[PDB]
Amino acid sequence: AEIYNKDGNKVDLYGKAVGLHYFSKGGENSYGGNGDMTYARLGFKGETQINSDLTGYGQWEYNFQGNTGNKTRHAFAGLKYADVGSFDYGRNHGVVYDALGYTDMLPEFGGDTAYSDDFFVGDVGGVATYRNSNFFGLVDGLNFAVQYLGKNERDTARRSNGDGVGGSISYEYEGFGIVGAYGAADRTNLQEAQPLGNGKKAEQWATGLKYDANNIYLAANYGETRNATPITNKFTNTSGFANKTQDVLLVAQYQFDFGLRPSIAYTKSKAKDVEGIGDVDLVNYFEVGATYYFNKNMSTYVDYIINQIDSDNKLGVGSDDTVAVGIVYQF
Amino acid sequence: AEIYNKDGNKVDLYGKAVGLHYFSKGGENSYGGNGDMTYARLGFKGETQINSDLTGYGQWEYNFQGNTGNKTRHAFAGLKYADVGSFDYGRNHGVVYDALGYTDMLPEFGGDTAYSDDFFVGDVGGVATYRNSNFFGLVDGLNFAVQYLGKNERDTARRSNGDGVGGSISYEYEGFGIVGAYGAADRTNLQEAQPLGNGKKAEQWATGLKYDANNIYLAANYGETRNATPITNKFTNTSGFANKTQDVLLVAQYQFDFGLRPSIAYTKSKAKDVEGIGDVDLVNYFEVGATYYFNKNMSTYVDYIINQIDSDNKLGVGSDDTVAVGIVYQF
Amino acid sequence: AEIYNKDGNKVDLYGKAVGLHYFSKGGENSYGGNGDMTYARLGFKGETQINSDLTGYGQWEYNFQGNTGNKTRHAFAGLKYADVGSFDYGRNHGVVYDALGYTDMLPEFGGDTAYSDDFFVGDVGGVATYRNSNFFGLVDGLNFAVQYLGKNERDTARRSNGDGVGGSISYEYEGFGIVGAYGAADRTNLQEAQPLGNGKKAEQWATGLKYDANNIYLAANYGETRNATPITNKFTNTSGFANKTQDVLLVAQYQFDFGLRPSIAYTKSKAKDVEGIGDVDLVNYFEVGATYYFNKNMSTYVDYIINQIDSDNKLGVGSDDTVAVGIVYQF
Ligand SMILES: [Zn+2]
Ligand SMILES: [Zn+2]
Ligand SMILES: [Zn+2]
């Protein structure tokens, strides 16, 4: 929904309402919880044409919970020059999300390893991102990004980070996409004080393949982290980071013409060398679900998580299944 | 204010600014308090036409305090089919508000028994509501709704609830409306732990008549609750629910052509079998007030509460008068 | 960006995204801090034409932090009559900001003495403001305002205030503006309980000159306060108000045609008769900075604060420099 178009400036307002309910046994010990999870979104996107070759842009988006959970998701501005690329700064996706966003396609769940405020894998504040598409207008399909992560010292370890760099490479050909991304940063003094996880530097990287054509969507991600994945020991009420993780995400979806979109997926996340515990799974589930698209504005969906986590998990990660049911209006 | 109209999708943005001040003696012991109460509202309403017979819709609205008090008020989406009715899920009005909203017409106050997060009587999160108007297109004026209330377990008893059902019937003829509504739900374990109120099931119901024609508005509500009205003993700092309440609300207003709209009202709420106290009034006042409408966008108002609560109230409910003065811009 | 124009009602939606980073040594002991400070703004402005001579209006604006700091900035409505003036009530600027806003022109910093929730000098809630421009349509350039400040009793002393009055006079001629403003109010019981600052009445006043023409901007402010400037003793973790302050702000800026806008400024704030301390500076710095305007929608900026505060400051006010870098998209 555009609200302004004059002097080469465009503004688009957008938002959605999501009525959303989670079902689990009784649901402290489930994958997703139990109860109401309804929320709304509001944001704008602006693009201004400064000259023939240069464009300016900003974007904001907020999450309002309708059930705590109220969050800015995007807040950034930047410039794009003809074939040199684009620069922007703000709260934006980490560059490793260039890989991980390949499998972030399920109706409600999925994307379990794209934590917010976790350096590079997800929704993070204070990142400057240089981006180049089709490699200086020379090689169509080939894209790359480099990103500087500013130091964020905050009250909790979970949401803090030090100075860091990362980058991504992508190639997109005949309906396929392959991607690799890597990032490293300093850990804050407070993080290194935490019980779990130890090391001066944190690191995250992932690769990915996707196929997005002929009403099919199929994507696979492999990632590894060092000292970067936040974990909590629900038994001893201890927090920190996992020294190493190894994560696999697979998704397969097909889009029927009449608007039904079934989905199957798998997610497995394993921490290694966790202080006190050793090897323990963080995430392990299959997902079967479907979305029904009535049109570009309206949809409903059901998202079942068959949880492979064992009830005897040592970190006390929840072992029960959760199904989400959701109805969505967006503009 | 519509911002989109193409492909049978409409989006309306709306909001208002309310400059608002309350006056009381000195005002801990007043009906309404004392000081600034200014606030703003923002929301959207969308409607998409899926086919000949089916429509999709969503709605969101937020309250921003300008003086804590920041709240989502509506967040829901749903579908409406030609003469079968409508279904929606989200944060919405309880179905008992179908009755109580008859007397919710005063400039600033009123509607004292339509608590938020109180099962069925007001603004509540996690409700699926089926609605039918003109009874399958057969009997004009006759409407009914049934509603399922999902279990909401939260940190305080006041804002939690268990699984529940409710319904409403309404008839609207020659300027009149009559309505009855009823709802029952399980109380959470935490609620039953509270000092005040005891019982496994909570219940609320109300009836109402209104006359809304010839520039007149006249409405009466009677309600009763069991184990559902939140009460606080300000003497002993004790909380819970009233075992029984009996509530009466009357309103009478006339709209002058030149934009003045005087208003008189009465509200009385009595709790019975309150643990330790017995019978005690929660609300007891007369209201005299007026709104001046300059047009569809601008208005000011004054709202005087003559408080009948006695200073010796045993729950320490406040006994002093409050007048509100308010100026409002809306679009 | 206007979204409505029919029946003499106009609504303008507006907002901006600001990617913003502060740089300081290591930055507890700096002027501005250190890290990400990105934020977004959203607001509307409405104007309705009631009759030939009378107009209604409302305005709201919110600040969303993207890094706590989420705030309503404006929320008010009012009426303007042909040559009698205008009245409005809400969260608005104190009338002393009529003076202080002259020097509030730097890219990111500046305006250090226009505290929010500080009676009269800045962003304050619960003020009714009468305003008259060109003195009843008789003397072009000559303007005045009188303002009543309602009592705000809150949990902290810093953000509370009692009943008060203030006013301002302004003259604007051939590119110049001169202004004087004054305000006085009661201090709340809680404020008078604080360690620092003592007196029953608080007072603030300031004068100002500005020159705003030929691509130049030049402004000077002098102010004094009594018992109104909030100060904190970071050594002993003590709070309150300064018994007296004396504040000077100077700014000089030039706007190049091609969009560069260099800026130099000076700010000095001195508290006197501070309980335990005596005479101590609160603010003391030079600013050199520049903004680059690409157009009416896009801009970037750098803002350097050369901090004159001494490391041996007795209130433990921070002594290090801070440079801000920022990119801005607005509509
Ligand atoms: Zn995002
Ligand atoms: Zn409502
Ligand atoms: Zn302001």
From Swiss-Prot, chains A, B, C:
Top-rank taxon, per record: Bacteria
Effect of inactivating the gene: Leads to decreased susceptibility to a number of hydrophilic antibiotics including ampicillin, cefoxitin and tetracycline. Deletion of ompF confers resistance to colicin E5.
Phenotype upon changing Q253L: In strain: B/r; AA sequence
Gene Ontology biological process terms, A to Z: monoatomic ion transmembrane transport; protein homotrimerization; protein transport
Pfam families (UniProt xref): Porin_1 (PF00267)
Family matches, as InterPro entries: Gram-neg_bact_OMP (IPR050298), Gram_neg_porin_domain (IPR033900), Porin_dom_sf (IPR023614), Porin_gammaproteobac (IPR001897), Porin_Gram-ve (IPR001702), Porin_Gram-ve_CS (IPR013793)
Membrane topology classification: Multi-pass membrane protein
Induction conditions: By growth in low osmolarity conditions (low sugar or salt); activated at low osmolarity by OmpR, repressed at high osmolarity by OmpR (at protein level). Levels of OmpF protein decrease in a lon/ycgE double disruption (at protein level).
Ranges in the topological domain labelled Extracellular: 24-37, 92-125, 151-162, 187-201, 227-243, 273-282, 307-321
Segments on the Periplasmic side according to the record's topology features: 7, 51-52, 83-84, 133-140, 174, 214, 257-258, 295-296
Residues annotated as transmembrane: 1-6, 8-23, 38-50, 53-65, 74-82, 85-91, 126-132, 141-150, 163-173, 175-186, 202-213, 215-226, 244-256, 259-272, 283-294, 297-306, 322-331
Listed result of changing E108G: In strain: B/r; AA sequence
PROSITE patterns for this protein: GRAM_NEG_PORIN
Locations listed in the record: Cell outer membrane
Keyword field: Cell outer membrane, Ion transport, Membrane, Porin, Protein transport, Signal, Transmembrane, Transmembrane beta strand, Transport
GO molecular function, one term: monoatomic ion channel activity
CC terms in the record's Gene Ontology section: cell outer membrane; membrane; monoatomic ion channel complex; pore complex
Function noted in UniProt: Forms pores that allow passive diffusion of small molecules across the outer membrane.
Domain-related comment: Each subunit of the trimer has a water-filled pore with a narrow, elliptically shaped (7 X 11 Angstroms) selectivity filter which has a solvent accessible area of 30-40 Angstroms(2).
Subunit structure, interactors included: Homotrimer. Forms mixed heterotrimers with OmpC and with PhoE; other mixed heterotrimers are also probable.
Similarity-based family: Belongs to the Gram-negative porin family.
Protein's name in the database: Outer membrane porin F
Organism whose genome encodes this protein: Escherichia coli (strain K12)
Organism placement in taxonomy: Bacteria, Pseudomonadati, Pseudomonadota, Gammaproteobacteria, Enterobacterales
